[PDB]
Amino acid sequence: APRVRYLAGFCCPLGGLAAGKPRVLCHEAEVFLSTGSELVYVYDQEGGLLTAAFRFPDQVWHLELLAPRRLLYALCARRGLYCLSLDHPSPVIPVDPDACILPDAALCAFTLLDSVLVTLVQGPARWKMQLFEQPCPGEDPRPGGQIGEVELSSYTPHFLPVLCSVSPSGSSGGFTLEDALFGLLFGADATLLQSPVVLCGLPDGQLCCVILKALVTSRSAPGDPNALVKILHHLEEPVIFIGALKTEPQEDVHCDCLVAFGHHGRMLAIKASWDESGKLVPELREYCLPGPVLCAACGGGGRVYHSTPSDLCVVDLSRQPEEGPGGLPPMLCPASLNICSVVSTKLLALSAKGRLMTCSLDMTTESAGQKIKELLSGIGNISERVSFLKKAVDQRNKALTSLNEAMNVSCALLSSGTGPRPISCTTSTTWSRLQTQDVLMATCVLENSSSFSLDQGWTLCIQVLTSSCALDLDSACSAITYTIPVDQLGPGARREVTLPLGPGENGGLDLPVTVSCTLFYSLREVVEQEGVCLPLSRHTVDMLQCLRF
């Protein structure tokens, strides 16, 4: 009867908890959690009380879990990797540095297989992938010696890269494909050897796979990069999430479809085709979703459960092959980042506020009447706000057309149809008289011949250039500029403006004087550096016009 329920919420910062880092992991009703602080939490999933609380040093960056071995691996940021016996003889507990193994310190990201550990180590520019044994007998929980390192030569530097395990059928914390796909992506080597393969997405968005049978090397026997790591598709944004998906749904599920995500939301589904050549080709799409995407998961039957920062949204891929677009719902759950999926679908979270919460998915007399009362009121709430948005849409639309007349005017002027039809401005000279003295005025007529009504946003500049030939002594006044807003000009309609050009100082007027008239359109005015200025006429006032008889 509560399709969503709360367990415990945490010390957030402002905004709330960022992405990459935090992790949730459910065991049976044992549950595990990194809030991307130094602290990993353990909850009784029946009763949202805490069993077990752990302090590490420095900011936990990722978890995994081996159920057989009853162990948890926990990456501290600038330290190496600390492993915990789950029985583990205040409910707060520091780790001792004993539980430390491979303090490599320079390691971002790691995964598990069976008896194998795969780390990914930051360096200088070249990231290299390392690989260690992991002791299959219940022993001291050891690394062993490194089998394998290579350079992700492809990779040259907030966003923590991620790795994945992909084992084919017959041969555990990963994904099995169907042998058709497995074969299509990686190829024969991989298929033959029943090699579990590891996919690294990287902050660039680059999604590289590596074949773990093939990563065995020594000082006398180094990794070649180009052999050994290969590069599948390059999303141009950081990678949040990889999985595989059982489309065609007709515990070890044999998936058919490989799923990637970006951050800004290019997602990438991949499938088997075998089409049109009787030959295997991989169906690619690169759909282009909403939002920053901020965690993802896979749940029963071709359904991805993902976050925007708005809302918790979900996609279907189930039903050519896969699909034209993934147009996509929420379920009206807020931004949880840090999601997971256990299959019975019942998925679990940490809410971007700070919240640990568990989503379960799938006539009376007169309180039918109260139902009606309420339902109208709901629509009475919505409708207002719909309407709001239309009016906004009006402003937007009117503006485009408002712009559209701008593009049309601009284009007509930049064309030489050989007569400056659309807008013209004439200038012409007029001896006035002031206080005593005869003065020279230049009348500046703007005339609209064309249809186009020079709306608000438009504005006229005139510039009054003295003599040209820049001097030894820089004059007092190089030139003057006058500038006016044009309003609503209309077709046919006109403005005139007269200036001074004439002497106050010296009785001193020297020629040629030129007056170039021009137009700016203001983009902002209707609501990178931004306007457009457009060049109308350019008239020379010479010694002939300034004569008077």
Partner 1 sequence: MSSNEQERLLCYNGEVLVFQLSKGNTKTPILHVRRMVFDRGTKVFVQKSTGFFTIKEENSHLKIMCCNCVSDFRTGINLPYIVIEKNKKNNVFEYFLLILHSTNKFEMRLSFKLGYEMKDGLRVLNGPLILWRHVKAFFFISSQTGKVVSVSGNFSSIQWAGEIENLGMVLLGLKECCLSEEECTSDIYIIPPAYSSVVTYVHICATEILRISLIALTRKNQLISFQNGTPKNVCQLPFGDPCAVQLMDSGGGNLFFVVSFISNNACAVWKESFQVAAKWEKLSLVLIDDFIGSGTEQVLLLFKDSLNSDCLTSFKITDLGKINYSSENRYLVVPPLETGLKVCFSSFRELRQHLLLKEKIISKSYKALINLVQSEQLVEKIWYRVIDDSLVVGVKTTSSLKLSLNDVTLSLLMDQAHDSRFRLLKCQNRVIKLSTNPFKKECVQIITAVTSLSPLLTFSKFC
Partner 2 sequence: PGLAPPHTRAPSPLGPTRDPVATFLETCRELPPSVASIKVSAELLRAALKDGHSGVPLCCATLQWLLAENAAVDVVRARALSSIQGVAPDGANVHLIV
Partner 3 sequence: MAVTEASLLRQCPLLLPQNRSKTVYEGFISAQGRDFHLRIVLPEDLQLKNARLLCSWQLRTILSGYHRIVQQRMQHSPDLMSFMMELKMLLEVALKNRQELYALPPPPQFYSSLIEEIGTLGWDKLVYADTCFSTIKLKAEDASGREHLITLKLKAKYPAESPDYFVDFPVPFCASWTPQSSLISIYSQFLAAIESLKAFWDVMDEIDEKTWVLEPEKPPRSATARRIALGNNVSINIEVDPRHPTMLPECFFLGADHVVKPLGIKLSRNIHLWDPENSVLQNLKDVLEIDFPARAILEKSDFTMDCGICYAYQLDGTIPDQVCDNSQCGQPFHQICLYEWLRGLLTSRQSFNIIFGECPYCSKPITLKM
CB of 310 to partner 3, least distance (A): 20
The rounded distance, in Å, linking the Cα atoms of 40 and 86 is: 12
Return the residue of 171, 395, 404, 430 that touches partner 3, per CB under 8 A: 404
Handedness of CA 92, 96, 101, 107 (dihedral sign): positive
Residues in region 483-522 near partner 2 by CB under 8 A: 492-496
The dihedrals phi and psi of 282, each to the nearest 5 degrees, come to -90, 125
Handedness of CA 169, 188, 259, 356 (dihedral sign): positive
* Sheet arrangement for strand 494-500: 423-434, 437-448, 494-500
419, interface contact from partner 2, partner 1, partner 3, none, CB < 5-8 Å by kind:
none
CB of 380 to partner 3, least distance (A): 7
The rounded distance, in Å, linking the Cα atoms of 174 and 172 is: 6
Applying CB under 8 A, does 382 fall inside the site for partner 1?
yes
29, interface contact from partner 2, partner 3, partner 1, none, CB < 5-8 Å by kind:
none
405, interface contact from partner 2, partner 3, partner 1, none, CB < 5-8 Å by kind:
partner 3
Indicate the pairing of strand 437-448 with strand 494-500: antiparallel
Per-position DSSP letters for 502-527, written without gaps between them:
S-SSTT---S-EEEEEEEEE-SGGG-
CB of 162 to partner 1, least distance (A): 24
CB of 500 to partner 1, least distance (A): 10
494, interface contact from partner 1, partner 2, partner 3, none, CB < 5-8 Å by kind:
partner 2
* Binding track, positions 70-109, relative to partner 1; x by CB under 8 A: --------------------x-x-----------------
Interface segment toward partner 3; rule CB under 8 A; list 94-102, 334-342, 394-402, 516-524: 394-402
Break-preceding residues in the chain (C–N over 2.5 Å): 89, 157, 171, 250, 319, 344, 362, 527
Q: Which residues pair with 118 in a beta bridge?
A: 111, 131
| Nearest alpha carbon to residue 297 among 226, 252, 346, 332 | 346
**First and final CA of the chain: distance in angstroms?**
101
Of residues 179 and 447, the one with the C-beta less far from partner 1:
447
Applying CB under 8 A, does 18 fall inside the site for partner 2?
no
* Binding track, positions 363-382, relative to partner 3; x by CB under 8 A: ---------x---x--xx-x
Of residues 9 and 491, the one with the C-beta less far from partner 2:
491
345, interface contact from partner 2, partner 3, partner 1, none, CB < 5-8 Å by kind:
none
* Binding track, positions 223-252, relative to partner 1; x by CB under 8 A: ------------------------------
Is 92 in a helix, a strand, or coil? strand
Site residues (vs partner 2, CB under 8 A): 492-496
